[PDB]
Each structure stands twice: as C-alpha cells, then as structure tokens.
Design a protein around this ligand. Structure first.
Ligand code: JIM
Ligand code: CL
Length: 175
C-alpha cells in the first residue's frame, strides 16, 4: 500500500558519472522533513559551486560560492564518494552525512536525496547548470517530494537576484 519513488532509486557512480558532474552547478532548492533544517537553509540566498572529482581517491573537491546575509562566502572542502551505493557524503557538524546522487533525465539538473539517516530528517535538494529553471525542469524533483510526502509549501528556493559571489568568481577566473 506504500507507493514507491522511481526517481529515488540509487544508481551506482562510475568514472563516467563523475565526469558527468564535473564542473559548475547552481543550488536551486531544497525541502526537508525536519523544520529546523528548512529554517537553517532559509539563510542561504544563493550558492554556485564547482566539482572536481578525484577518481583514485573516491573524493570530489568542492569550491563553493555562497551568498548569505548579502555577502559572498567562499569555501573549499572534499566530499567522499561511495560508488557502489550511489552516494556522496559531506561532514556536517563533524558527522558524515550521505546523499544519493540522482542525475535527472536531463543531464543539466541532478538531485541529492538525503534519505540515508533517520526518516524524520530526510530531505531532497536540486541543482542545475544555470541559476534559473522552469517548473517543468523541476518535474522530477516535485514528483519525488510528493512521493516522500513533503509538501511543495515546504520547499526553500534560492533567489539568484540576491547573488553576491559573481564578482568574486569573476576575479578568481581573471587570475
Ligand atoms: C552530501 C551532502 O550533504 O552535500 C553535498 C553538497 O553539500 C552539495 O554541493
Ligand atoms: Cl519519485
């Protein structure tokens, strides 16, 4: 009687999948079951970032340009990859958290499903290769939320008009 979620089926990460995610992405939206997670995420006004996989070490080097309180905060870190599980992981508050990487029909968008920990904390984020998207580009994201029974009204979106990091990224590139 519990309908299952075809867009959330894990898919093993290969060297080809690591090439597919190499490059620049924009953070578009998330929604979590935990309300404090939604409110925490609400302070992030925009974020774009670059991934550079290291296939030997099963890591990905992340350079992130986040706008928070109307300024740019730049940070680098390493994510771990669990190839056979289809997950990538990041240390959050000193604990490793895992997410399934789900590359969408259109390889221009992908989602991270945070469905590896306690069920009361599950959530979904979606990313694209441009800062703006259409409702249609987000079809798989909204279907998955419906299937996870997270209402659309809990989604937190970034607002690209608020970005402050394009000026920095531009200088990082001139150098
Ligand atoms: C795995 C995880 O918690 O996050 C991946 C990263 O935050 C998105 O760029
Ligand atoms: Cl689904």
């Amino acid at each position: 009687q519990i309908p299952l979620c075809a867009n959330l089926v894990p898919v093993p990460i290969t060297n080809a999948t690591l090439d597919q995610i190499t490059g620049k992405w924009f953070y578009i939206a998330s929604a979590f079951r935990n309300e404090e997670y939604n409110k925490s995420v609400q302070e992030i006004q925009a974020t774009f970032f670059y991934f550079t996989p290291n296939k030997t070490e099963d890591t990905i080097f992340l350079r992130e340009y986040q706008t928070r309180q109307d300024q740019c905060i730049y940070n680098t870190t390493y994510l771990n990859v669990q190839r056979e599980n289809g997950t990538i992981s990041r240390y959050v508050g000193g604990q490793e958290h895992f997410a399934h990487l789900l590359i969408l029909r259109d390889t221009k968008t992908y989602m991270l499903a945070f469905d590896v920990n306690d069920e009361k904390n599950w959530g979904l984020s979606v990313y694209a290769d441009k800062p703006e998207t259409t409702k249609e580009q987000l079809g798989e994201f909204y279907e998955a939320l419906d299937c996870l029974r997270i209402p659309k009204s809990d989604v937190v979106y970034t607002d690209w008009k608020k970005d402050k990091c394009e000026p920095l990224e531009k200088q990082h590139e001139k150098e």
